[PDB]
């Protein structure tokens, strides 16, 4: 009734005003459940219209926050789900909402066991005394590191970001395990190069041409990586395949307020200064190296055929 | 218990009255969007579950635009109940009526309908709560400013005030304004009654923001000789204490004037208000629809943009929007439904919906209200206001300072 | 050379704090890091090498021993017993090139928020009701912190400019009373510099409450001195 | 040193801001003359940060020391000069780290000293220094950057998009005599934690009427293909061809390539080192760890860093910088390329 | 790669203050390699030797690179024994930086203009037996002891006077060899 009505804009509310869950994981199992809500306590009769208010509700939670991609994942595997059951069935309009509700749970379960998935997978990739390097805060870097140190050992360089100074706490929570870590500026980051061995960071989201979208400054880490001809290889879950390719996109960066870099208190020379925060930032895909998954790494070039199965061609616009 | 707030539509003072014969201060756009608009979305994020309004004058058009807003929706965590009395002339009269009608059961928030702010409120509100049960009911106020430079645009002099605090606890133990004084005095008490920190602070900006407690209105009927919150806090302080808190990530201002309009519409414009954005279209409307570009650029649905037209640095388009050829908007914001002309320079200046600008037309710091019509060759000096339906014709140079209106008093015609 | 060591003490000075002369105790702080010569200023009770001179008030000595400093001088009391380091007081003089370099210690005055420059000074006696502050300097200044229990320990680093002007003008007597509030109203280039230790002794003995509270305070310091 | 060093720079010193070496010092200082005890607390208290600043203020010392100087007895000035000027250098290095132009003027007095004839009387040995000493800071330092300045007039046009990193009074002086003579721009300001020290340069360009932007390092790929030239700064200048300075140089540099935009640096001639370096580990200074500490949201996350064994903070200064990623080099004597500064220097 | 006694001095002399590894890669028509390798092993160096056609599969974990050269060109160019080429090649595309130590004395003011004798011939013996059968009138056996590095894969020359840049050799040359002198 109007319960489910409410969760709604709730949720559409804490995504627009603010930011939501801290883990990508949480935000994804919250949207697969209230996805899972709508079906359940809502009135169709057939898979036509569902798919109408399925699209419907996922273009309303783009439009709250475009600089995500992680409702709109939910809202198109929700929708191949559905295509999928009505073409086994029809190819009907009696147990469709039992198998909805089965490859729901099925796809909560594969979600929770994507994080052991790509943790198991560490020590292959990882050698003793080696250099590996980290920009910011992710919760997928860290249970790597965590895991290919329980039997190894090496060294680890974290840089944090100058906005949000996220590294710290990555810092501190592996130091707190024993890797030996170090703390340094972005500034210092070609000088740290040509003594690390290799390069291991997250992502937001990933394109469709191979390309990715990660915090600030990992543009210029890529960019020293080539230049030092290092590995660069990039774990991050299969929720973050977005089949959208790199447009224009004016408003791909996400930009706040501009107290983070400069301080209110600055006089009356902020009247006529330009300052712009941005977030988010392009990373090419040539200075990508590979692409480590819950289901075993990949080059770059396959980021089309992983997202071909994910997503239906029709449902790429939503 | 729920948490609840008190907003005084009507502005007591007067002054913003070239214009305000015709529409409240409340309903003035800052960009395109109502000032109670945003005091409500404030209100709505900070956490406030129920909202009380107070309208005096012009009070119809308050209600029915209130009615129209998305706060009214039957799907909202915010109610708005509206209050309409034609005897309110200052707030301690909205005051002694609240204490009057017992609307209020804990403490509360007393805002005004024309502030803009970003701040939540999660830790002042629980240290003056924490204050409040310790030393059992001695705080009543708990004042909230926004740590700045006196150098700033946005501190205007007729807003500026020095206070003295405690260093140790957060408590104001002086307040005045600073307006035409050039030596301020601190009374004595404060130095030979006791110690620990008896700093005197003066990078404090105004944001008029007050979380006020359920004996502060029977204080105001108390004493029948209370009109605004200053003359309460400097007759507090006479004898009940007053605390203070400071934030230094938020933003937070009150347009009162002219000047602090234009520096408030410019900190939004350069996102400064974050997430309170153009972009983000908070008021959930179809209208208002635009997309964010680079150099803080803002363009809705059918610009029209036409070819040679540069924009320097950030400008607001709304929806309809005309543009001629080879023209330069640099700083300005533009109403929708506009028809600009060709040739055109706009620097620091606001138009309003219904604007018509001839070709040729130079305007700087200038404001337009409603339905304004500019001929050509027509040169605008800065801080000339505009009010809605002025036929202004050509060949004509209006000096700095110049106002015209419909109104015969009001300056010219 | 940097320093002149004004000792100026003008039998009070020979009296018996912790069964030593009162004049010991600056004598002592002074001879432990260089400060080989001492300029002494007294009557006559005189008994490391020390210079003393039978001569008033503070200024007035200062001028009559005007031709013999050739260099800053450092300015001294008779009654001081303190144990805190020279070199924190000498710093703020040295790196920041100040006029007058003070020293307090907690039991009006102003500083920044940092908490070493001085900004304003005022004693009860000279204002009558209200406590004025010029707006220049709340412009420049925002914050001011004002500290009202705090001792004076007649410590004062002048500069030889400072001298030079105290030469030509008598009507200053008192160095305390007249000299240090002068300078801070006039930089309002001229800069003034102050130090709290929080943490020390920093007793001058001039009544019988203070007397015995120094009697009392000796022991525990003459431990370590000697 | 104060704290605990990472393997790779455990060859540099570490030292601390708040430890100062004055406590255990004679307040009338006699062994060290007292103007270099206190050009040691400046420069530990970081007073004088300029690259040109701390040379001057060296010279002016040595100046006052020299006015100030007597002659031993039976002992040349030019003997014995040296080997106490010597105490005074060294502790000058205990408290800061020196840079290129403080080697490069401490060899110029040594030269000049030892070069001083042994029947010249004292008083004349003295003028003559401080003589010398004035005429080399002028033609060092104020002929050279009007020279500078010229050369660089010649390559700023109207409508140009110029993009600075850090604090130089050498950019900032050209960029306001090019403003002054007539060109119309707009300037990109750059700045990089903990220092912040492109907040006076942009200070100053706000104040000269030179429209500004602000802007941190990690964010400069986005506003790169918006910029028009890049000029930066030089500390010193290496026999190999490389550039040494602020160490969010060579990253800016790199990425000013990828996204082909030319990168001008402008130097002096007594810059010039006797020096050839590859990386930026072999030679660098360490400062003070606790500076990289920040107040985000309501606490630090680094505030017991010193309580984890598996924890280092790292602060490099400087960095070295290839001629492969350096377009034009601007003298004092003229517009040069990369590779060929060592012809000229020397 | 090679036998460099300018190269096996510059290695043997910082051995004593430092421990470091060596790899040595040998050479395929005469294994000169393999006694600079045992030479380098008696001094307490902690040495390696490996074939030749193992230089790229290495080149990842190698953080400096020292060889030795025969003579130098006019343009900063190079000539050292064969497959020093590929050596520059993997060091250019790995980005670690090629240093080549080499006395004054080897200077040669002479550009690469097609002479066609840069790398000289022997004998294919040291490549194919002579017992290999009557194959050996049909096939052709080249066995060059030479090649040509080009400046571009050069990073610092060791000179009594400093490092110096592959850029600055003709300054050297302008001041050692009057220009007339060059044809000889």
Same mark, same amino acid.
């Given at each position: 009734?109007?319960?489910?009505?409410?969760?709604?804009?709730?949720?559409?509310?804490?995504?627009?005003?603010?930011?939501?869950?801290?883990?990508?994981?949480?935000?994804?199992?919250?949207?697969?459940?209230?996805?899972?809500?709508?079906?359940?306590?809502?009135?169709?009769?057939?898979?036509?219209?569902?798919?109408?208010?399925?699209?419907?509700?996922?273009?309303?939670?783009?439009?709250?926050?475009?600089?995500?991609?992680?409702?709109?994942?939910?809202?198109?595997?929700?929708?191949?789900?559905?295509?999928?059951?009505?073409?086994?069935?029809?190819?009907?309009?009696?147990?469709?909402?039992?198998?909805?509700?089965?490859?729901?749970?099925?796809?909560?379960?594969?979600?929770?066991?994507?994080?052991?998935?790509?943790?198991?997978?560490?020590?292959?990739?990882?050698?003793?005394?080696?250099?590996?390097?980290?920009?910011?805060?992710?919760?997928?870097?860290?249970?790597?590191?965590?895991?290919?140190?329980?039997?190894?050992?090496?060294?680890?360089?974290?840089?944090?970001?100058?906005?949000?100074?996220?590294?710290?706490?990555?810092?501190?929570?592996?130091?707190?395990?024993?890797?030996?870590?170090?703390?340094?500026?972005?500034?210092?980051?070609?000088?740290?190069?040509?003594?690390?061995?290799?390069?291991?960071?997250?992502?937001?989201?990933?394109?469709?041409?191979?390309?990715?979208?990660?915090?600030?400054?990992?543009?210029?880490?890529?960019?020293?990586?080539?230049?030092?001809?290092?590995?660069?290889?990039?774990?991050?879950?299969?929720?973050?395949?977005?089949?959208?390719?790199?447009?224009?996109?004016?408003?791909?960066?996400?930009?706040?307020?501009?107290?983070?870099?400069?301080?209110?208190?600055?006089?009356?020379?902020?009247?006529?200064?330009?300052?712009?925060?941005?977030?988010?930032?392009?990373?090419?895909?040539?200075?990508?190296?590979?692409?480590?998954?819950?289901?075993?790494?990949?080059?770059?070039?396959?980021?089309?055929?992983?997202?071909?199965?994910?997503?239906?061609?029709?449902?790429?616009?939503? | 218990?729920?948490?609840?707030?008190?907003?005084?539509?009507?502005?007591?003072?007067?002054?913003?009255?070239?214009?305000?014969?015709?529409?409240?201060?409340?309903?003035?756009?800052?960009?395109?969007?109502?000032?109670?608009?945003?005091?409500?979305?404030?209100?709505?994020?900070?956490?406030?579950?129920?909202?009380?309004?107070?309208?005096?004058?012009?009070?119809?058009?308050?209600?029915?635009?209130?009615?129209?807003?998305?706060?009214?929706?039957?799907?909202?965590?915010?109610?708005?109940?509206?209050?309409?009395?034609?005897?309110?002339?200052?707030?301690?009269?909205?005051?002694?009526?609240?204490?009057?009608?017992?609307?209020?059961?804990?403490?509360?928030?007393?805002?005004?309908?024309?502030?803009?702010?970003?701040?939540?409120?999660?830790?002042?509100?629980?240290?003056?709560?924490?204050?409040?049960?310790?030393?059992?009911?001695?705080?009543?106020?708990?004042?909230?400013?926004?740590?700045?430079?006196?150098?700033?645009?946005?501190?205007?002099?007729?807003?500026?005030?020095?206070?003295?605090?405690?260093?140790?606890?957060?408590?104001?133990?002086?307040?005045?304004?600073?307006?035409?004084?050039?030596?301020?005095?601190?009374?004595?008490?404060?130095?030979?009654?006791?110690?620990?920190?008896?700093?005197?602070?003066?990078?404090?900006?105004?944001?008029?923001?007050?979380?006020?407690?359920?004996?502060?209105?029977?204080?105001?009927?108390?004493?029948?000789?209370?009109?605004?919150?200053?003359?309460?806090?400097?007759?507090?302080?006479?004898?009940?204490?007053?605390?203070?808190?400071?934030?230094?990530?938020?933003?937070?201002?009150?347009?009162?004037?002219?000047?602090?309009?234009?520096?408030?519409?410019?900190?939004?414009?350069?996102?400064?208000?974050?997430?309170?954005?153009?972009?983000?279209?908070?008021?959930?409307?179809?209208?208002?629809?635009?997309?964010?570009?680079?150099?803080?650029?803002?363009?809705?649905?059918?610009?029209?943009?036409?070819?040679?037209?540069?924009?320097?640095?950030?400008?607001?388009?709304?929806?309809?929007?005309?543009?001629?050829?080879?023209?330069?908007?640099?700083?300005?914001?533009?109403?929708?439904?506009?028809?600009?002309?060709?040739?055109?320079?706009?620097?620091?200046?606001?138009?309003?919906?219904?604007?018509?600008?001839?070709?040729?037309?130079?305007?700087?710091?200038?404001?337009?209200?409603?339905?304004?019509?500019?001929?050509?060759?027509?040169?605008?000096?800065?801080?000339?206001?505009?009010?809605?339906?002025?036929?202004?014709?050509?060949?004509?140079?209006?000096?700095?300072?110049?106002?015209?209106?419909?109104?015969?008093?009001?300056?010219?015609? | 050379?940097?320093?002149?060591?004004?000792?100026?003490?003008?039998?009070?000075?020979?009296?018996?704090?912790?069964?030593?002369?009162?004049?010991?105790?600056?004598?002592?702080?002074?001879?432990?890091?260089?400060?080989?010569?001492?300029?002494?200023?007294?009557?006559?009770?005189?008994?490391?090498?020390?210079?003393?001179?039978?001569?008033?008030?503070?200024?007035?000595?200062?001028?009559?021993?005007?031709?013999?400093?050739?260099?800053?001088?450092?300015?001294?009391?008779?009654?001081?017993?303190?144990?805190?380091?020279?070199?924190?007081?000498?710093?703020?003089?040295?790196?920041?090139?100040?006029?007058?370099?003070?020293?307090?210690?907690?039991?009006?005055?102003?500083?920044?928020?940092?908490?070493?420059?001085?900004?304003?000074?005022?004693?009860?006696?000279?204002?009558?009701?209200?406590?004025?502050?010029?707006?220049?300097?709340?412009?420049?200044?925002?914050?001011?912190?004002?500290?009202?229990?705090?001792?004076?320990?007649?410590?004062?680093?002048?500069?030889?400019?400072?001298?030079?002007?105290?030469?030509?003008?008598?009507?200053?007597?008192?160095?305390?009373?007249?000299?240090?509030?002068?300078?801070?109203?006039?930089?309002?280039?001229?800069?003034?510099?102050?130090?709290?230790?929080?943490?020390?002794?920093?007793?001058?003995?001039?009544?019988?409450?203070?007397?015995?509270?120094?009697?009392?305070?000796?022991?525990?310091?003459?431990?370590?001195?000697? | 040193?104060?704290?605990?060093?990472?393997?790779?720079?455990?060859?540099?010193?570490?030292?601390?801001?708040?430890?100062?070496?004055?406590?255990?010092?004679?307040?009338?200082?006699?062994?060290?003359?007292?103007?270099?005890?206190?050009?040691?607390?400046?420069?530990?208290?970081?007073?004088?940060?300029?690259?040109?600043?701390?040379?001057?203020?060296?010279?002016?010392?040595?100046?006052?020391?020299?006015?100030?100087?007597?002659?031993?007895?039976?002992?040349?000035?030019?003997?014995?000069?040296?080997?106490?000027?010597?105490?005074?250098?060294?502790?000058?290095?205990?408290?800061?780290?020196?840079?290129?132009?403080?080697?490069?003027?401490?060899?110029?007095?040594?030269?000049?000293?030892?070069?001083?004839?042994?029947?010249?009387?004292?008083?004349?040995?003295?003028?003559?220094?401080?003589?010398?000493?004035?005429?080399?800071?002028?033609?060092?330092?104020?002929?050279?950057?009007?020279?500078?300045?010229?050369? =660089?007039?010649?390559?700023?046009? @109207? *409508?140009? +998009?110029?993009?600075?990193? $850090?604090?130089?009074? #050498?950019?900032?002086?050209?960029?306001?005599?090019?403003?002054?003579?007539?060109?119309?721009?707009?300037?990109?300001?750059?700045?990089?934690?903990?220092?912040?020290?492109?907040?006076?340069?942009?200070?100053?360009?706000?104040?000269?009427?030179?429209?500004?932007?602000?802007?941190?390092?990690?964010?400069?790929?986005?506003?790169?293909?918006?910029?028009?030239?890049?000029?930066?700064? =030089?500390?010193?200048?290496?026999? @190999? *061809?490389? +550039?040494?300075?602020?160490? $969010?140089?060579?990253? #800016?540099?790199?990425?000013?390539?990828?996204?082909?935009?030319?990168?001008?640096?402008?130097?002096?001639?007594?810059?010039?080192?006797?020096?050839?370096?590859?990386?930026?580990?072999?030679?660098?200074?360490?400062?003070?760890?606790?500076?990289?500490?920040?107040?985000?949201?309501?606490?630090?996350?680094?505030?017991?860093?010193?309580?984890?064994?598996?924890?280092?903070?790292?602060?490099?200064?400087?960095?070295?910088?290839?001629?492969?990623?350096?377009?034009?080099?601007?003298?004092?004597?003229?517009?040069?390329?990369?590779?060929?500064?060592?012809?000229?220097?020397?």
């Amino acid at each position: 009734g109007s319960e489910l009505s409410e969760r709604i804009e709730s949720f559409v509310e804490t995504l627009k005003r603010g930011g939501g869950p801290r883990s990508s994981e949480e935000m994804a199992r919250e949207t697969l459940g209230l996805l899972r809500q709508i079906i359940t306590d809502h009135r169709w009769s057939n898979a036509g219209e569902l798919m109408e208010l399925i699209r419907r509700e996922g273009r309303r939670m783009t439009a709250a926050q475009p600089s995500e991609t992680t409702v709109g994942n939910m809202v198109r595997r929700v929708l191949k789900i559905i295509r999928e059951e009505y073409g086994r069935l029809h190819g009907h309009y009696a147990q469709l909402q039992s198998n909805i509700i089965e490859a729901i749970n099925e796809l909560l379960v594969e979600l929770e066991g994507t994080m052991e998935n790509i943790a198991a997978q560490a020590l292959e990739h990882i050698h003793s005394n080696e250099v590996i390097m980290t920009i910011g805060f992710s919760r997928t870097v860290e249970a790597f590191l965590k895991e290919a140190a329980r039997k190894r050992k090496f060294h680890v360089i974290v840089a944090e970001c100058a906005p949000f100074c996220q590294g710290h706490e990555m810092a501190v929570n592996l130091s707190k395990a024993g890797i030996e870590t170090t703390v340094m500026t972005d500034a210092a980051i070609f000088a740290v190069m040509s003594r690390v061995n290799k390069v291991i960071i997250g992502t937001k989201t990933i394109l469709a041409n191979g390309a990715l979208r990660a915090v600030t400054g990992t543009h210029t880490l890529a960019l020293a990586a080539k230049h030092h001809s290092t590995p660069l290889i990039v774990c991050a879950p299969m929720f973050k395949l977005s089949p959208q390719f790199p447009n224009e996109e004016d408003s791909f960066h996400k930009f706040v307020a501009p107290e983070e870099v400069l301080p209110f208190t600055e006089g009356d020379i902020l009247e006529k200064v330009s300052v712009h925060c941005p977030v988010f930032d392009y990373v090419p895909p040539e200075l990508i190296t590979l692409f480590i998954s819950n289901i075993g790494g990949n080059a770059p070039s396959y980021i089309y055929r992983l997202m071909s199965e994910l997503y239906h061609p029709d449902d790429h616009v939503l | 218990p729920p948490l609840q707030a008190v907003l005084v539509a009507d502005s007591f003072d007067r002054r913003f009255f070239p214009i305000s014969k015709d529409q409240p201060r409340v309903l003035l756009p800052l960009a395109n969007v109502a000032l109670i608009d945003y005091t409500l979305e404030f209100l709505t994020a900070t956490g406030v579950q129920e909202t009380f309004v107070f309208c005096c004058w012009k009070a119809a058009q308050i209600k029915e635009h209130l009615l129209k807003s998305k706060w009214c929706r039957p799907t909202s965590l915010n109610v708005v109940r509206i209050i309409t009395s034609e005897l309110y002339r200052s707030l301690g009269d909205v005051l002694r009526d609240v204490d009057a009608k017992a609307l209020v059961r804990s403490d509360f928030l007393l805002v005004y309908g024309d502030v803009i702010s970003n701040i939540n409120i999660t830790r002042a509100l629980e240290e003056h709560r924490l204050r409040r049960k310790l030393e059992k009911n001695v705080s009543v106020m708990t004042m909230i400013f926004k740590e700045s430079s006196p150098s700033h645009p946005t501190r205007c002099h007729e807003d500026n005030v020095v206070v003295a605090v405690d260093s140790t606890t957060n408590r104001v133990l002086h307040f005045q304004k600073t307006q035409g004084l050039r030596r301020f005095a601190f009374p004595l008490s404060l130095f030979q009654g006791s110690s620990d920190g008896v700093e005197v602070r003066y990078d404090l900006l105004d944001c008029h923001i007050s979380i006020c407690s359920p004996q502060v209105a029977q204080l105001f009927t108390d004493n029948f000789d209370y009109q605004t919150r200053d003359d309460f806090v400097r007759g507090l302080l006479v004898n009940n204490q007053i605390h203070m808190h400071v934030t230094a990530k938020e933003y937070g201002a009150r347009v009162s004037n002219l000047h602090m309009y234009s520096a408030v519409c410019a900190d939004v414009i350069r996102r400064w208000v974050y997430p309170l954005t153009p972009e983000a279209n908070f008021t959930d409307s179809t209208t208002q629809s635009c997309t964010h570009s680079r150099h803080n650029i803002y363009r809705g649905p059918e610009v029209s943009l036409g070819h040679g037209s540069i924009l320097e640095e950030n400008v607001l388009l709304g929806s309809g929007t005309v543009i001629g050829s080879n023209c330069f908007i640099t700083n300005s914001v533009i109403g929708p439904g506009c028809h600009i002309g060709d040739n055109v320079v706009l620097d620091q200046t606001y138009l309003w919906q219904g604007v018509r600008v001839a070709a040729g037309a130079q305007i700087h710091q200038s404001l337009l209200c409603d339905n304004a019509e500019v001929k050509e060759r027509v040169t605008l000096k800065p801080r000339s206001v505009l009010t809605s339906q002025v036929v202004v014709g050509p060949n004509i140079t209006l000096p700095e300072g110049s106002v015209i209106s419909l109104h015969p008093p009001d300056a010219e015609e | 050379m940097e320093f002149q060591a004004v000792v100026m003490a003008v039998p009070k000075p020979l009296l018996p704090v912790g069964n030593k002369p009162l004049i010991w105790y600056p004598l002592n702080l002074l001879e432990r890091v260089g400060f080989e010569e001492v300029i002494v200023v007294t009557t006559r009770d005189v008994q490391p090498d020390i210079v003393c001179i039978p001569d008033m008030g503070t200024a007035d000595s200062l001028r009559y021993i005007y031709p013999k400093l050739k260099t800053d001088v450092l300015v001294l009391s008779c009654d001081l017993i303190t144990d805190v380091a020279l070199h924190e007081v000498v710093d703020l003089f040295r790196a920041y090139d100040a006029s007058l370099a003070m020293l307090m210690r907690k039991g009006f005055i102003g500083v920044d928020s940092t908490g070493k420059r001085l900004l304003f000074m005022a004693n009860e006696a000279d204002l009558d009701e209200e406590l004025v502050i010029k707006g220049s300097i709340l412009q420049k200044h925002p914050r001011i912190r004002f500290h009202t229990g705090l001792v004076d320990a007649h410590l004062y680093c002048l500069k030889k400019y400072i001298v030079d002007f105290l030469m030509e003008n008598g009507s200053i007597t008192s160095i305390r009373s007249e000299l240090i509030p002068y300078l801070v109203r006039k930089q309002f280039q001229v800069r003034c510099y102050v130090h709290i230790m929080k943490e020390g002794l920093c007793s001058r003995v001039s009544t019988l409450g203070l007397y015995m509270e120094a009697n009392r305070q000796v022991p525990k310091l003459l431990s370590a001195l000697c | 040193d104060y704290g605990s060093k990472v393997s790779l720079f455990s060859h540099l010193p570490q030292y601390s801001r708040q430890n100062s070496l004055t406590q255990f010092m004679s307040i009338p200082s006699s062994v060290i003359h007292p103007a270099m005890v206190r050009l040691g607390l400046q420069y530990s208290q970081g007073l004088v940060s300029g690259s040109n600043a701390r040379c001057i203020a060296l010279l002016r010392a040595l100046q006052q020391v020299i006015q100030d100087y007597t002659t031993p007895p039976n002992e040349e000035l030019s003997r014995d000069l040296v080997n106490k000027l010597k105490p005074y250098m060294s502790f000058l290095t205990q408290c800061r780290p020196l840079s290129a132009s403080m080697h490069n003027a401490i060899k110029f007095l040594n030269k000049e000293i030892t070069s001083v004839g042994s029947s010249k009387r004292e008083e004349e040995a003295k003028s003559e220094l401080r003589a010398a000493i004035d005429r080399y800071v002028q033609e060092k330092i104020v002929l050279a950057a009007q020279a500078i300045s010229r050369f =660089a007039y010649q390559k700023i046009s @109207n *409508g140009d +998009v110029i993009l600075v990193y $850090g604090c130089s009074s #050498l950019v900032s002086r050209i960029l306001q005599e090019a403003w002054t003579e007539g060109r119309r721009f707009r300037v990109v300001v750059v700045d990089s934690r903990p220092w912040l020290e492109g907040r006076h340069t942009l200070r100053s360009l706000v104040h000269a009427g030179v429209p500004a932007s602000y802007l941190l390092i990690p964010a400069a790929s986005y506003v790169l293909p918006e910029v028009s030239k890049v000029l930066l700064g =030089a500390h010193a200048l290496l026999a @190999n *061809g490389s +550039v040494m300075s602020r160490v $969010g140089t060579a990253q #800016l540099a790199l990425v000013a390539r990828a996204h082909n935009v030319p990168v001008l640096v402008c130097c002096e001639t007594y810059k010039f080192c006797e020096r050839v370096q590859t990386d930026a580990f072999v030679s660098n200074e360490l400062d003070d760890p606790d500076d990289l500490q920040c107040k985000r949201g309501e606490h630090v996350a680094l505030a017991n860093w010193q309580n984890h064994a598996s924890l280092r903070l790292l602060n490099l200064v400087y960095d070295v910088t290839p001629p492969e990623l350096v377009d034009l080099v601007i003298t004092e004597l003229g517009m040069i390329p990369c590779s060929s500064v060592p012809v000229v220097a020397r």
